[PDB]
Design a protein around this ligand. Structure first.
Ligand SMILES: Cc1cccc(CC(=O)n2ccc3c(F)c(-c4cn(C)c5ncnc(N)c45)ccc32)n1
Length: 247
């Protein structure tokens, strides 16, 4: 409706719902537009609409810039966000499979922006719940952005309690961050080596070369991956960790 009227579709970017790249006819900018099927039940609908009003207030360097939300008639909710690069963080790591291509400083600076975005959210009483490299983005200016979240794939980055449907808190994001930090610092040759190693890391089994090369990050990651959520550090403790002192 308003979508087909005010926008020219360019391509599907992903399919929780569907995300399209599309160009606004009036301002000629390209945007990522998320379309979700709105719940039929009235109470369940109001839940979604409350989440939208909360997220639309958020403004942070690590949060994708927001533009607009509207409904169209079955009802569809449309969310218009800034279009990020096609190369997400998963792609970024895929094209960089050697140590030399994963410079310590560039990697930590990437992780740090993720962690700061997460700390911002937690401080607002929100959590991300969906942190993983395929859902971490770069703007056209190369600012790191946490990806889509708010309204609820691989479970590889998902905390135990979140996988098993147990009660959970913002500590679930800390678990994800831990695995992402390791993955940032430890390139893989093959997809299968990636899965074999990551599942081991979830279980606190690390490659010796990692522990020796990154003794401090190793200890951080160990803590963030505690099976017990209470034991994981707060996002603020992580951001303040000595490992990030070289600015
Ligand atoms: C209503 C509202 C306001 C502010 C923030 C949010 C939550 C949020 O970060 N997002 C909501 C939909 C969404 C979202 F669809 C993308 C996105 C997905 N894909 C595949 C992309 N590719 C390029 N650029 C993007 N921005 C994206 C990123 C973030 C998104 N909600």
């Amino acid at each position: 409706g308003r979508y087909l009227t005010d926008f020219e579709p360019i391509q599907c970017l992903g399919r929780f719902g569907v995300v399209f790249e599309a160009k606004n006819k009036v301002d000629d900018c390209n945007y990522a537009i998320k379309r979700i099927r709105l719940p039929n039940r009235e109470l369940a609908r109001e839940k979604v609409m409350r989440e939208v009003k909360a997220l639309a207030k958020l403004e942070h360097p690590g949060i994708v810039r927001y533009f607009n939300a509207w409904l169209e008639k079955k009802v569809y909710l449309y969310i218009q966000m800034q279009l990020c690069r096609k190369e997400n963080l998963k792609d970024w790591m895929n094209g960089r499979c050697t140590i030399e291509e994963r410079e310590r400083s560039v990697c930590l600076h990437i992780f740090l922006q993720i962690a700061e975005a997460v700390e911002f959210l937690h401080s607002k009483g929100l959590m991300h719940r969906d942190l993983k490299p395929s859902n971490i983005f770069f703007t056209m200016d190369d600012v790191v952005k946490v990806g889509d979240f708010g309204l609820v794939g691989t479970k590889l980055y998902m905390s135990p309690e979140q996988i098993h449907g147990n009660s959970y808190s913002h500590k679930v994001d800390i678990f994800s961050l831990g695995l992402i930090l390791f993955e940032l610092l430890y390139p893989f040759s093959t997809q299968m080596e990636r899965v074999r190693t990551l599942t081991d890391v979830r279980n606190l089994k690390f490659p010796p070369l990692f522990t020796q090369k990154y003794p401090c990050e190793y200890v951080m990651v160990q803590d963030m991956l505690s099976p017990s959520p209470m034991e994981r550090p707060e996002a603020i403790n992580i951001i303040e960790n000595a490992v990030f002192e070289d600015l």
